[PDB]
Amino acid sequence: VLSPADKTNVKAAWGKVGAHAGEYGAEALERMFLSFPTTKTYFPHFDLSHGSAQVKGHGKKVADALTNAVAHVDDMPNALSALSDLHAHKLRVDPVNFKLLSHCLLVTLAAHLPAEFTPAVHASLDKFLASVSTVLTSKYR
């Protein structure tokens, strides 16, 4: 659902993320692969080693999809309509894996925005990433 207090918190902390957007995006990725190996099975054609420009380019890609979400939050379904088919229809990504990325995504933000990552905002992002996850796994339900 997301409350106005939530979408205001999300919009602020992401504002603060600024141009490091695509960077934090590649950091979450790298974190997930190292913590949850079982996820690497989706990126064979990727050289998941620390400097991978491939992992980098995808991170930028992930950040942007999240940015597209914050700026259209009151209507994500229609917005991520396309990424839904891709992740659920074509790639068949296990739904569990979204909970694992959302986590490394909060750990990446918390390690970069000590001032903003307050419990309240912490909770707001978690709902946001939860909602983003539901949309991408919508073409399953």
Partner 1 sequence: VHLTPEEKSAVTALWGKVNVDEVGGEALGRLLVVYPWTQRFFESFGDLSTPDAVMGNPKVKAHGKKVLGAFSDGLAHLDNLKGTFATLSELHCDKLHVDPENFRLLGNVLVCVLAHHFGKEFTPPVQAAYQKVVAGVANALAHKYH
The binding site consists of 58, 87
CB of 107 to a second copy, least distance (A): 20
Shortest spacing between CB 42 and ligand HEM, in angstroms: 4
Q: In this structure, are residues 127 and 2 in contact, taking their beta carbons and an 8 Å threshold?
A: yes
Indicate the residue among 38 and 81 with the shorter CB distance to partner 1.
38
Instruction: Determine if 107 is a binding residue for ligand HEM (CB under 6 A).
Output: no
Which residue has 């990725």 as its token pair? 29
DSSP reduced 3-state for 111 = coil
CA distance 99 to 6: 19
Contacts for 98 with CB less than 8 Å, ≥ 6 apart: 133, 136, 137
Q: In angstroms, what is the minimal distance from the CB of 74 to ligand HEM?
A: 17
Chain contacts with a second copy (rule: CB under 8 A)? 1-2, 127, 130-131, 134, 138-139, 141
Binding site per annotation, positions for heme b: 87
Contact 107, 126 (CB under 8 A): no
CB 130, CB 102: distance < 8 Å: yes
- Least distance in angstroms from the C-beta of 126 to partner 1: 5
> Which of ligand HEM, a second copy, partner 1, none sits in contact with 123, Cβ below 5 to 8 A by type?
partner 1
The CA distance from 73 to 36, in Å, is 29
H or E element at residue 38: none
Give me the 23-62 binding string for ligand HEM, x by CB under 6 A, dash otherwise: ----------------x--xx-----------------xx
Which of partner 1, a second copy, ligand HEM, none is residue 111 near (CB under 5 to 8 Å by kind)?
partner 1
Which residue is associated with the tokens 């995504």? 105
Query: Quick check: 84 binds ligand HEM (CB under 6 A)?
Result: no
